[PDB]
Amino acid sequence: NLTSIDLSPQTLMAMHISISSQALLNQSYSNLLLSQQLLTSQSMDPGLTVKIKAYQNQLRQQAQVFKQNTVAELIGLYTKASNFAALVNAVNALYSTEDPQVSQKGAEMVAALSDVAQHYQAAAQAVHTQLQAKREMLEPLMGNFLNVIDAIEQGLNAEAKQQAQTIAELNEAIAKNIQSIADAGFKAGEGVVQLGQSIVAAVPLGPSDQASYMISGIQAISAGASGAQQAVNELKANYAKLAVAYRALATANALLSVAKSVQAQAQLFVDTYVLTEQRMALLPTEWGKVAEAYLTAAPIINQAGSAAEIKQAKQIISLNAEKWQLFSKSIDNAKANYAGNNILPEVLE
């Protein structure tokens, strides 16, 4: 009986919001990697200088790819959801009970949307397979650069290892702060996201070439109106300490200080890329659930041949339409955010 058909978006609304959350942030981490000053100096360890410049270059290539290609691929999948909402409205409009065969024509269209949902499932799979491929190339790229930093650190005296750990610990703290700020800006999908950037630290380089390597860091847009004031205060305090800690490690190991600064930025990008891939892994299945739900619903909608059965079906469809319209708005805002969040503006005090 009709009482059992589910023409709803299921967990698509929430599933798209959990994707937006990481993809939008990863958009900002891509902008950070592309804004960061390159290492120019050729007056330091020739062997390690080439490993940093090579890694920094390989990261900007992947940041550009994510920013220009992968974001567009996602906006494509979101549009497909709007499109589906629009089609459900049409089914609603068809139930103006003017038509003497209204239930056979209704069944036919629900059966057709089952097909569309199956295409949107396959479209999502295609995007996930590309994200999975990049993940499998990014993990070993970062993994290899970590083994390079580690080999260098394993040969330092105790004073330098402590200066290096202080830095590693602060980068880990700063990442938790940024995440807290981004969550507050995002407002669980209903927010209009913006993150900024500024120079936060510097690495003096032994004695003009590149007097100093300038370190770019994410910043909140409003140092007193973001709805995560404690995180903004911790971020300010942590950047202050980060500046001091690089000045310390730099006295003796300047080039390692640089390598660490780059790896901290890579970590944010690769970690949230992995989370983007993982949230996207569930999307094809969720479209497939809409496909199965719509396939099962159609023959049941066809059995409705009475006055009260057609009235009940109009009601079941009108309700599920409202659900898709609400979802369509969540999508409109996500697309506006992917457009607006394409730039990571400078912030000044």
Numbering used by the authors: 3 to 209, 226 to 367
Publication excerpt:
We present the structures of the soluble A component (SmhA), as well as the soluble and pore conformations of the B component (SmhB).
This crystal form contained four closely related molecules in the asymmetric unit (rmsD Cα between molecules of 0.4–0.6 Å), with no oligomeric structures observed. SmhA folds into two distinct domains, a compact five helical bundle (α1, α2, α3, α6 and α7), and an associated head domain containing two helices (α4 and α5), and the β-tongue domain (two long anti-parallel β-strands, β1 and β2). Residues E192-V205 (β1 and loop to α3) and Y231-N250 (β2 and loop to α4) of the β-tongue domain are largely hydrophobic containing only polar uncharged and nonpolar residues, and are buried in the core of the protein, packing against α1, α3, α4, α5 (residues A272-Q283), and residues N351-E367 at the C-terminus. However, in SmhA, NheA and Hbl-B, this region has an additional extended loop and short helix that extends the length of the tail domain, a feature not observed in SmhB or AhlB. AhlB and SmhB use both a short β-strand and a short helix connected by a loop, while SmhA uses only a short loop perpendicular to β1. As soluble SmhA, SmhB and AhlB all share very similar structures, we propose that the head domain of SmhA would also unfold into its pore form about 2 hinges in the same way as seen in SmhB and AhlB, with hinge 1 between α3 and α4, and α5 and α6, and hinge 2 between α4 and β1, and α5 and β2.
